[PDB]
Design a protein around this ligand. Structure first.
Ligand SMILES: [Ca+2]
Ligand SMILES: [Ca+2]
Ligand SMILES: [Ca+2]
Ligand SMILES: [Ca+2]
Ligand SMILES: [Ca+2]
Ligand SMILES: [Ca+2]
Ligand SMILES: [Ca+2]
Length: 145
């Protein structure tokens, strides 16, 4: 958090600096190296802001197996919709040409065809469907708690 007497003369650390105290993106960055793991982190971190405490509650929401809030933290391997319709590869461009994708929203983990919520749609984790008629649709993922 940048709060002592000479903390920044030391090697940045993730537990100390961000998981034990709140942090700036620069502090996380400084403790990660890869900008890529920082994008990944910062994303699953900012989405867990309302689950800081307890910290077992923080470890839950950062793990991504449960949707917390609107499920922007969700990083699970569920890929079928609310209706049962399978999801379109995020990287596929057919049947629907996704406007949301890895270059656009790099912290999210648009892998395979797994439900996500890169955007924080109020209906939660979604994905694009394979049905030509239904572009996107919410998915049923276990809620943090
Ligand atoms: Ca600190
Ligand atoms: Ca610091
Ligand atoms: Ca630091
Ligand atoms: Ca600790
Ligand atoms: Ca501390
Ligand atoms: Ca710096
Ligand atoms: Ca610093």
């Amino acid at each position: 958090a940048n709060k002592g007497f000479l903390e920044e003369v030391r090697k940045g650390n993730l537990e100390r600096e961000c998981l034990e105290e709140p942090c700036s993106r620069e502090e996380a960055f400084e403790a990660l190296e890869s900008l890529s793991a920082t994008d990944a982190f910062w994303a699953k971190y900012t989405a867990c802001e309302s689950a800081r405490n307890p910290r077992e509650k923080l470890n839950e929401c950062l793990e991504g197996n449960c949707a917390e809030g609107v499920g922007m933290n969700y990083r699970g391997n569920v890929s079928v919709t609310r209706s049962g319709i399978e999801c379109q590869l995020w990287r596929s461009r057919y049947p629907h040409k996704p406007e949301i994708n890895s270059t656009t929203h790099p912290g999210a983990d648009l892998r395979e065809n797994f439900c996500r919520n890169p955007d924080g749609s109020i209906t939660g984790p979604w994905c694009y469907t394979t049905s030509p008629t239904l572009r996107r649709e919410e998915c049923s993922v276990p809620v943090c708690g």
